[PDB]
Motif scaffolding. Sequence first.
Motif, mmCIF file in Angstrom:
data_model
loop_
_atom_site.group_PDB
_atom_site.id
_atom_site.type_symbol
_atom_site.label_atom_id
_atom_site.label_comp_id
_atom_site.label_asym_id
_atom_site.label_seq_id
_atom_site.Cartn_x
_atom_site.Cartn_y
_atom_site.Cartn_z
ATOM 1 N N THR C 191 0.851 -1.177 0.000
ATOM 2 C CA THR C 191 0.000 0.000 0.000
ATOM 3 C C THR C 191 0.897 1.240 0.000
ATOM 4 O O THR C 191 1.901 1.283 0.708
ATOM 5 C CB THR C 191 -0.967 0.017 1.207
ATOM 6 N N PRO C 192 0.569 2.243 -0.829
ATOM 7 C CA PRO C 192 -0.527 2.296 -1.804
ATOM 8 C C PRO C 192 -0.385 1.310 -2.962
ATOM 9 O O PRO C 192 0.700 0.790 -3.211
ATOM 10 C CB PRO C 192 -0.460 3.737 -2.326
ATOM 11 N N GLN C 229 -3.931 5.203 -2.306
ATOM 12 C CA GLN C 229 -3.318 5.305 -0.990
ATOM 13 C C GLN C 229 -4.162 4.630 0.085
ATOM 14 O O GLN C 229 -3.645 4.218 1.121
ATOM 15 C CB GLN C 229 -3.072 6.770 -0.635
ATOM 16 N N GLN C 230 -5.459 4.511 -0.173
ATOM 17 C CA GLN C 230 -6.365 3.871 0.769
ATOM 18 C C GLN C 230 -6.667 2.436 0.349
ATOM 19 O O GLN C 230 -7.655 1.851 0.791
ATOM 20 C CB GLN C 230 -7.668 4.667 0.889
ATOM 21 N N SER C 231 -5.817 1.872 -0.504
ATOM 22 C CA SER C 231 -6.022 0.511 -0.992
ATOM 23 C C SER C 231 -4.867 -0.409 -0.619
ATOM 24 O O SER C 231 -3.756 0.050 -0.358
ATOM 25 C CB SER C 231 -6.209 0.505 -2.509
ATOM 26 N N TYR C 232 -5.141 -1.709 -0.598
ATOM 27 C CA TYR C 232 -4.115 -2.718 -0.350
ATOM 28 C C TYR C 232 -4.060 -3.727 -1.492
ATOM 29 O O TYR C 232 -5.091 -4.073 -2.074
ATOM 30 C CB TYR C 232 -4.378 -3.462 0.961
ATOM 31 N N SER C 233 -2.860 -4.200 -1.810
ATOM 32 C CA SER C 233 -2.719 -5.317 -2.732
ATOM 33 C C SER C 233 -2.120 -6.516 -2.014
ATOM 34 O O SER C 233 -1.008 -6.452 -1.490
ATOM 35 C CB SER C 233 -1.861 -4.941 -3.932
ATOM 36 N N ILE C 234 -2.865 -7.615 -2.008
ATOM 37 C CA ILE C 234 -2.518 -8.780 -1.208
ATOM 38 C C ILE C 234 -2.217 -10.005 -2.064
ATOM 39 O O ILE C 234 -3.117 -10.579 -2.678
ATOM 40 C CB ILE C 234 -3.655 -9.124 -0.235
ATOM 41 N N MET C 235 -0.947 -10.398 -2.098
ATOM 42 C CA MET C 235 -0.534 -11.605 -2.803
ATOM 43 C C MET C 235 -1.281 -12.816 -2.256
ATOM 44 O O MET C 235 -1.260 -13.077 -1.051
ATOM 45 C CB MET C 235 0.978 -11.810 -2.680
ATOM 46 N N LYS C 239 -0.907 -20.622 -8.888
ATOM 47 C CA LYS C 239 -1.224 -22.041 -8.980
ATOM 48 C C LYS C 239 -1.961 -22.357 -10.273
ATOM 49 O O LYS C 239 -2.941 -21.698 -10.607
ATOM 50 C CB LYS C 239 -2.063 -22.466 -7.770
ATOM 51 N N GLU C 240 -1.477 -23.368 -10.990
ATOM 52 C CA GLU C 240 -2.082 -23.812 -12.244
ATOM 53 C C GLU C 240 -2.151 -22.697 -13.284
ATOM 54 O O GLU C 240 -3.235 -22.323 -13.736
ATOM 55 C CB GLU C 240 -3.482 -24.384 -11.991
ATOM 56 N N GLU C 241 -0.982 -22.173 -13.644
ATOM 57 C CA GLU C 241 -0.839 -21.198 -14.726
ATOM 58 C C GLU C 241 -1.602 -19.892 -14.512
ATOM 59 O O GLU C 241 -2.018 -19.250 -15.474
ATOM 60 C CB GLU C 241 -1.278 -21.814 -16.057
ATOM 61 N N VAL C 242 -1.785 -19.493 -13.259
ATOM 62 C CA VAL C 242 -2.403 -18.201 -12.985
ATOM 63 C C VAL C 242 -1.945 -17.604 -11.657
ATOM 64 O O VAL C 242 -2.039 -18.235 -10.604
ATOM 65 C CB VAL C 242 -3.947 -18.296 -12.998
ATOM 66 N N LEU C 243 -1.427 -16.384 -11.732
ATOM 67 C CA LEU C 243 -1.103 -15.600 -10.549
ATOM 68 C C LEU C 243 -2.301 -14.747 -10.163
ATOM 69 O O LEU C 243 -2.838 -14.019 -10.992
ATOM 70 C CB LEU C 243 0.117 -14.713 -10.804
ATOM 71 N N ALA C 244 -2.722 -14.838 -8.908
ATOM 72 C CA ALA C 244 -3.850 -14.043 -8.439
ATOM 73 C C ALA C 244 -3.520 -13.310 -7.147
ATOM 74 O O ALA C 244 -2.996 -13.900 -6.203
ATOM 75 C CB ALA C 244 -5.078 -14.924 -8.245
ATOM 76 N N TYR C 245 -3.825 -12.018 -7.115
ATOM 77 C CA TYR C 245 -3.677 -11.234 -5.897
ATOM 78 C C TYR C 245 -4.917 -10.383 -5.660
ATOM 79 O O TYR C 245 -5.555 -9.917 -6.602
ATOM 80 C CB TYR C 245 -2.420 -10.359 -5.953
ATOM 81 N N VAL C 246 -5.258 -10.196 -4.390
ATOM 82 C CA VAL C 246 -6.469 -9.477 -4.017
ATOM 83 C C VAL C 246 -6.202 -7.989 -3.836
ATOM 84 O O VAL C 246 -5.338 -7.594 -3.055
ATOM 85 C CB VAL C 246 -7.076 -10.038 -2.714
ATOM 86 N N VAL C 247 -6.942 -7.166 -4.568
ATOM 87 C CA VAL C 247 -6.865 -5.723 -4.395
ATOM 88 C C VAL C 247 -8.033 -5.248 -3.545
ATOM 89 O O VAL C 247 -9.197 -5.445 -3.892
ATOM 90 C CB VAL C 247 -6.859 -4.984 -5.744
ATOM 91 N N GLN C 248 -7.708 -4.628 -2.420
ATOM 92 C CA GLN C 248 -8.704 -4.196 -1.451
ATOM 93 C C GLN C 248 -8.968 -2.702 -1.610
ATOM 94 O O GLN C 248 -8.123 -1.874 -1.267
ATOM 95 C CB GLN C 248 -8.221 -4.522 -0.038
ATOM 96 N N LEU C 249 -10.140 -2.367 -2.143
ATOM 97 C CA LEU C 249 -10.481 -0.985 -2.468
ATOM 98 C C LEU C 249 -11.373 -0.341 -1.405
ATOM 99 O O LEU C 249 -12.215 -1.010 -0.803
ATOM 100 C CB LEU C 249 -11.174 -0.924 -3.832
#
Lengths: 456, 456, 456
Positions: C191-192, C229-235, C239-249
């Motif tokens: 963050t940001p 600035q008020q958001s988070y990005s969470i790894m 797994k299985e040919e895809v990277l995913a991360y959570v963006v907290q808005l």
Amino acid sequence: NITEEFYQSTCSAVSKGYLSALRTGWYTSVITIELSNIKKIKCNGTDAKIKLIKQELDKYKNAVTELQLLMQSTPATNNSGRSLGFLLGVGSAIASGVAVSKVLHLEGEVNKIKSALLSTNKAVVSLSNGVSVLTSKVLDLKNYIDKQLLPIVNKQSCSIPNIETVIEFQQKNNRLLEITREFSVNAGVTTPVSTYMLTNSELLSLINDMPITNDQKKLMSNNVQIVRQQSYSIMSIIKEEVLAYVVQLPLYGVIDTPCWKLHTSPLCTTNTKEGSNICLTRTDRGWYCDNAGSVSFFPQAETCKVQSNRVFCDTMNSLTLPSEVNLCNVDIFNPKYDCKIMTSKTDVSSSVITSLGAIVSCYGKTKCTASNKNRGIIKTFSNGCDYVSNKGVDTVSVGNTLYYVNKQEGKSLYVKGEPIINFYDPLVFPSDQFDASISQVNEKINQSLAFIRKSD
Amino acid sequence: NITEEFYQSTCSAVSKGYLSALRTGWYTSVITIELSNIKKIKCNGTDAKIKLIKQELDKYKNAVTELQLLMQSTPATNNSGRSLGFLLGVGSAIASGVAVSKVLHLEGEVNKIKSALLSTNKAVVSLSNGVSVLTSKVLDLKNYIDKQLLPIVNKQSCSIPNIETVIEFQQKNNRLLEITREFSVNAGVTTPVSTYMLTNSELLSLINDMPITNDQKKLMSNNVQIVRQQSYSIMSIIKEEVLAYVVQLPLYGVIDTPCWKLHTSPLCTTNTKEGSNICLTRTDRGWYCDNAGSVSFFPQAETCKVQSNRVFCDTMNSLTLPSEVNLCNVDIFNPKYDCKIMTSKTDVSSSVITSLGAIVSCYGKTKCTASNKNRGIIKTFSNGCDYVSNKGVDTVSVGNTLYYVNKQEGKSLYVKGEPIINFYDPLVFPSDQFDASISQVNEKINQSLAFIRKSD
Amino acid sequence: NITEEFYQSTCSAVSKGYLSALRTGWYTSVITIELSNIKKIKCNGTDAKIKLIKQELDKYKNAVTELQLLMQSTPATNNSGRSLGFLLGVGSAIASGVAVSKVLHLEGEVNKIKSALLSTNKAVVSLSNGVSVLTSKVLDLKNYIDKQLLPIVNKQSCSIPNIETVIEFQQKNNRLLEITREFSVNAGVTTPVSTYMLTNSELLSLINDMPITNDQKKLMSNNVQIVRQQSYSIMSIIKEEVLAYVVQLPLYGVIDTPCWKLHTSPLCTTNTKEGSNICLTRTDRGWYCDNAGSVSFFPQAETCKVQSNRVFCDTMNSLTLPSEVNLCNVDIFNPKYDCKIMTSKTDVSSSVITSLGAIVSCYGKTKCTASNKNRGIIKTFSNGCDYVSNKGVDTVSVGNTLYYVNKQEGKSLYVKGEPIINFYDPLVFPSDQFDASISQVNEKINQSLAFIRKSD
Ligand SMILES: [Cl-]
Ligand SMILES: [Cl-]
Ligand SMILES: [Cl-]
């Protein structure tokens, strides 16, 4: 040459021999990047080198659009109990830079700056409000794009560019992307000022052209990394083929005045019965610098940065105190200055690593030692407040915490004295004075002795 | 397996089941990059590929010059009321690394390191002071420039290099530019240690070659991201074709000892008349770990980082307490340890999100609820201090503030008990004890009851 | 339009005219990057262009490996005395995002998301727990590598790729390397939220597709830099040919309610005898916003960010107070709300720069002035608490500290009144109330007057 004195009587230490570099003011310069206004990219040519140029030119456009959104906003930023930080005032760090930035939004001001930087990349411009600023052009993408990239953009043909141009454009455009990148995650205000924002060469050049003293020029040039940390970059305007942002540079109006650092640690009685002890701690820890007949005092550690024997501080986070504040180190019961302390009953062990040694507050059952790397333990501290110099000592252990000592060269002096906590009667000692002083504690004791006197 | 207990009597909660990973010491390694000493670039050839090499070589030179200015300085860094953070000592975080860095400035020391890394990229060097360190060569720009780029630089001809070399050199040089970039905005000291400073492969390799325990190696390797955050990179010297900086790595001397986290919240009486209430709050919140017969206590949240069920803490920001400090959770009036509290009259509503639930301090007219995402409100809190587990609950609302609860798996236990605030007579209750304890409050009450006894 | 009032009686100032933008909740979206599972790079061809592709493909593999190590960990982050910050509760900032991240680890959930993003790059997915989230594919390296880079990798021949492909792959791969770079120095939580994590176009698009109000969409889109600035990005998972991360808005449930900023400064008596003075300071400084019949109060400066006339705050760092808290600005002795103050004997000079002026607390021998850039000094402050507006004033000096004032346009009002410190008898004034209030001080005084009454 750094020296240090430990006062056994008040469990504190003073490190002398430092020279001041205090930021007292601000200098604001306007940094510009000449941009090429391009929309269209007329070319149906599906050539790979054209595609790469198109992609890079697309990043350029997104950066411009992104910066225009940032320009729409008004720049702003936001800059323990054993420290006196709560006594400080509240300044507005970028108020000066922002004031300049607002002037740049006025019509004609933008065109005024562009005129001055037409033939040269460095000029001084009189703003409509009546303020002169050093203006600088650090990048001309307008020139490069219009000179090297126009035929591949402005026309359906689109004569395919050499591979070296594709590489070169990515190199030049990169700086714009990084500047945009920094502003976008910092809401248009960055600190420290990066090399993207202002390169080492540009900053050094800017300093030399700053109409300041030769001492200041020398000072800032030998400590560029510190100057960057005490600077702000403020996104201002992107309008009519020019990106402009205000760089706010530190002004050091106080130089080479003596400074000293005061270290403090809890002083408690050492009775065997747990909880029957009373404690006392000097709360005036921090940096002190002689300044214009008074003393600038910096309670918080973040405020000051030490380079060898020179202390860089910011006056915004300081108090202006009578010079008699120094008397607290020689005679804490002096009648000229009411020395600040706090009282408590919590006798917990801890250590303070000083410039040239370590203060150890050892209480209760805590194991407290000092060691050399070769020999091992060379001193075991008894209960109370004690001190050891860094000469011959590499580490200090208090409980389960190992502290490395600073290996700075310099002489320490151990000033013997009766711990002042021994002067107080525990029966009437106020141990709830979180923010107090010598006289305020005395006043409390006199009141307690009065209510007792009435009863008797 | 994480468990948690809430104590209704003292408005606090303890989360158990964690394992320790405490940084107790430091390991210092010397990272080197072999640089090519080049000044001149003799070539009048205006070829585009030559121009690109020249431009990249110019960045290389500026980086070197920039680093030389940084080397001229001495490295330094600077590392609420309901927390006991003000009781902590003051360490010097990079004192160990800096001590090593100073040795590197001594003549012959530089040449000594370069000799060890002549045939291999990994070696142990005895320094002139008598200290051995793991030295590593992570980049050889000297080799690349002298082997691939000399004819295009050392001679007027200047046989034009292939385009792939232009690309390759930019790739290799980039790391030097980024390292320089980080040091220049951090005054020569960076933390966490980036992958530019030390790649994942290099760090993992360094850890394996660190003569530590197999447990420590496993621990550090499975938590590289945490290790980086607890590490420092210290710019040391750039002299005689070699850039060297000291990487200061955490040493975990305490592993797999039980840890617990204590959560605290205000406990006030709940009389209807506004302002006629008295409050009490446990101030010993934070992380606790068993450590060498005592307890390491970490008052500040920043000090500890939790990975699954393991707690990474730094002992520098800790106190060493008797194990009897844990008695405050079972019996706050225990005669073995004087449990720390603060008193007040300010009954303001708030919530503390714990590991496995939420503590709610609801007072006055505040709306306090707990909800499930599907059902909505499932519990309305009454005035006082209460608790709810995370099982079946997703959110908690106190006033206008919505808290999400942690969805960590684990059992909570509600330990019923009379709120201890009910045991005090408000007429003699000291509500101005900002930093106090159970016995100190009792002592105050006895004094008040004495002055009353004298009057009677 | 911003206005401001200074209250001479209590040495404080209120800035009105602001509009609220309070983060009340969270929205969680799942960002994905399709990865190509490749191990081998079968090619013995020593071609320079092949070598460059191999090197870039090696960075790709290391990033994937590095991210897989990060996935192994559970994401976590950790988010003065004159402020009431210690009264705040303790939330868990990324508890909502992490809850979503945990769902992604469940088997089938990954394949479920990949199915939804098969034909489109934007979809809504029902998770196995029963929660719907906006899922997005921002980069398809799987497609590029398998379509453009397979023959040079999957086969011994290895038909040498064009130079433009070498450049293009480095461009596309770069984003993956930077995302990995950010996560690796932030323990999987950033963050940001950077533009690498989510570009301006992607974020704006995400906001528009967020099923929120048109006002919220407009609000977030015009203030993207604040949203980041008020958001988070969470790894989360790779797994299985895809990277995913959570963006907290951020979710802004409160918009365009009136806000005001309260500035406070020490009020002391001004007797000539040093140390015979008593001080009083309002401790309820910070941001206030009307909110659902109550008032959201933000004691800490970091919590709120001002854009022109709109205030972006986070409710997690707030208290919910009765609206009568505003009465402290009009009548501090009002019978409806117990206004919070602190007492002391330490009369130190300082200044508070407000929205539209400056509060000056000038005591002792301190030189206190206000100046215009053209004229110079136009006002010399006397001892006590005073105020000056920003109209006609550019700077204010208190001792050795020069403050620049905000040049925001708006009217100031000077509300004359007797300093309330004059109402107290110094003989019975409690100057050790670090955290108190009007009634608590009165209560102390009544007790002191009682013990005196008993004696008499
Ligand atoms: Cl240390
Ligand atoms: Cl939350
Ligand atoms: Cl200022």
